[PDB]
Design a protein around this ligand. Structure first.
Ligand SMILES: Nc1ncnc2c1ncn2[C@@H]1O[C@H](COP(=O)(O)OP(=O)(O)O)[C@@H](O)[C@H]1O
Ligand SMILES: Nc1ncnc2c1ncn2[C@@H]1O[C@H](COP(=O)(O)OP(=O)(O)O)[C@@H](O)[C@H]1O
Ligand SMILES: [Co+2]
Ligand SMILES: [Co+2]
Lengths: 384, 384
């Protein structure tokens, strides 16, 4: 149980602080700054919300020249990275400002890698070369999910060969990330509820571990989980409450922090199972993790029952696993989320297909408990 | 309640990992590495403990040339910094390895500033110039206190003018810090108990705040505090227990982390009062904070009684402040620590003197509650 931790992304947390876009662009750009403004599609969202205005007002206030590059698709495309790299070498951009979510942050990270490289940037995703430098980006985050605003990962899909790939390296760390909980206000209900489930799930996947001697870490993960459980329902019924949004958005940031997960072994069983439901049905990730995770917990309740006793004691105030599992189901339901796959017209038709696709070329799946094709179908039956 | 957070010190946490001294020296040194080895006095301690051996074995295994510079005094002296700066410019040192505690880390940080500067490094402590670069240091921490192994501060005392000063800047951040809980084993009992109090106190000084809307942050600070309260007594009676030492040493690291204190206003009333007791008597910091903090809490129990209710509920399982205060006194006593100043032959003789020296040129002192000369004497009377 040894671990390393590094994370140098500067966090700018709060509201009415839109000057720090430019103030921080100057702190991390070479000499005279000339930035590239990255956003999804044609700024429809960020301009609708007023993020576009407040951004330009910050660059102007700081005399920061800038070009705009738009047109990100949810799974961002290497053809657009190739474009941004061209403009950054052509127009001498010294810094990229990602305004959006992980789809445009990942483009920002990919463009920032090849703007400084003299070769193909796909060599950095297909494991040919290990990038040693990046131009540098700052993020203006619009939705508190995934955590790409402080990760070292970038996920680009090359459509011409259809192979999606990633690149994990310490140079991908955004130089700063602007974190205003107000951006939560405009998010649609079902999207925000699923985002709450994503935070809790990210915490649970590291919490439920066969690792030992992790008491401080247990507490910190419990404390964050507990906050998501108290404030998640409140934010859902009072969507413009800055307090409620500060807790949830700060919980999500912490959820992506390996100071509180101290090299404890995460289990991705639920993620993988959910992935396959989402590959065949049009179902949002967070909603699928509210349906799958309680089923997975039921199936794995015998592995380490004490760590299940602990979870429901510290988080739901009950040493009864069954009562605690139903409380967690009730919590999901209080977010608007129906708890069964039948509810979403999903039938047992492809349970078998999804189980084999989950497993791929392996016999079992998971770390907390090793799950084979039938195990995975039993879990999908618990969730029907 | 907006805040910023940056911290890029790489944490290497664990044991039987002494290769990472050299492995990490190579990761952060320019081209060919030639390091300076910094330690207190003549390596008596670190060599006695076997840290010296295991270090040299790592530099050799990695072909790392190195000179040794010793002779740190607990309050490190600018005359020695001046020496180390000379050797770093003379002998072309590309990196400093601080092996010790905050006394030698602060020398390491000061030497690392002027090895790269073309002027006097005291200009960086006396607020004349703001350093913009540092050579770079890695720490091998021997005692989990103060947190200098991940701070941006360096505290040097110039003895020829007797003025002590500090320099706070993002370049002071160690490039890495080696954190092995085993180094806790050899620490004397009273020194380790006081170090446990220092962690709890660092957490309490930020916890007890007039700031509002800090629920997630409250939980994280509570979780850490609670761990210090559970494991601190156990580590005291089982000094070679790696688990117990991992929790406490990881609690101390987290205690110095502003991810869990989200720009909440800290109060230094207890620190300042304790400082003056320690200025007149030969009394260790941690012991003085076990005597002062319960007195300060008694005196300030009426400011924000709900945040006192909360503290003792989440940390001691009681909504009674009095019962909770006595529990905290009992906790200190379970660390070997006597709870009164009379016990240490300290009398009311200089309560008046210490109160004026605490206050300096100000009328009151503290943020949670503004404390004037008589307030401070009342608190010293509670602690007699
Ligand atoms: N502040 C916001 N308000 C409303 N909708 C948003 C906001 N931020 C993102 N979205 C929406 O969420 C959808 C998908 O989220 P995305 O931006 O890809 O972030 P992530 O990849 O982190 O989930 C987008 O179609 C976008 O319309
Ligand atoms: N691992 C250790 N084992 C025993 N004693 C230690 C250890 N590390 C430091 N000390 C002792 O603690 C005393 C003061 O601590 P110091 O090294 O100045 O660290 P800090 O300044 O962080 O408290 C020193 O005299 C030293 O003898
Ligand atoms: Co997940
Ligand atoms: Co203190």
């Amino acid at each position: 149980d040894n671990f390393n931790y590094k994370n140098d992304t500067k966090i700018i947390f709060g509201k009415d602080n839109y000057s720090e876009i430019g103030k921080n662009i100057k702190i991390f750009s070479k000499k005279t700054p000339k930035i590239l403004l990255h956003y999804e599609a044609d700024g429809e969202l960020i301009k609708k919300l007023g993020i576009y205005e407040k951004v330009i007002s910050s660059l102007k206030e700081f005399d920061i020249e800038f070009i705009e590059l738009g047109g990100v698709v949810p799974n961002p495309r290497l053809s657009l990275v190739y474009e941004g790299i061209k403009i950054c070498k052509e127009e001498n951009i010294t810094f990229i400002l990602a305004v959006g979510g992980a789809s445009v942050i990942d483009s920002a990270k990919a463009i920032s890698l090849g703007a400084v490289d003299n070769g193909d940037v796909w060599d950095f995703f297909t494991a040919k070369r290990i990038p040693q430098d990046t131009l540098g980006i700052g993020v203006v985050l619009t939705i508190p999910g995934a955590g790409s605003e402080m990760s070292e990962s970038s996920i680009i899909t090359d459509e011409n060969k259809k192979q999606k790939a990633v690149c994990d390296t310490e140079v991908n760390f955004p130089k700063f990330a602007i974190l205003n909980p107000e951006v939560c206000y405009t998010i649609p209900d079902r999207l925000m509820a699923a985002g709450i489930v994503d935070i809790l799930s990210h915490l649970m996947e590291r919490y439920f571990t066969k690792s030992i001697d992790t008491a401080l870490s247990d507490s910190l993960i419990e404390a964050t989980m507990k906050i998501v459980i108290k404030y998640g329902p409140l934010l859902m019924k009072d969507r413009k409450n800055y307090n409620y949004c500060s807790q949830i958005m700060w919980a999500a940031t912490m959820a992506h922090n390996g100071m509180i997960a101290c090299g404890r072994v995460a289990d991705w069983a639920s993620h993988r199972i959910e992935h396959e439901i989402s590959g065949i049905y049009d179902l949002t990730h967070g909603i699928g993790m509210a349906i799958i995770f309680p089923a997975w917990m039921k199936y794995t309740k015998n592995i380490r029952p004490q760590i299940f006793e602990k979870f429901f004691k510290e988080v739901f105030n009950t040493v009864n696993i069954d009562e605690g599992i139903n409380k967690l189901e009730e919590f999901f339901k209080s977010l608007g989320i129906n708890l069964k796959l039948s509810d979403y017209g999903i039938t047992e038709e492809y349970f078998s297909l999804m189980a084999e696709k989950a497993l791929g070329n392996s016999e079992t799946l998971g770390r907390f408990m090793q799950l084979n094709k039938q195990d995975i179908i039993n879990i999908l039956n618990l969730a029907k």
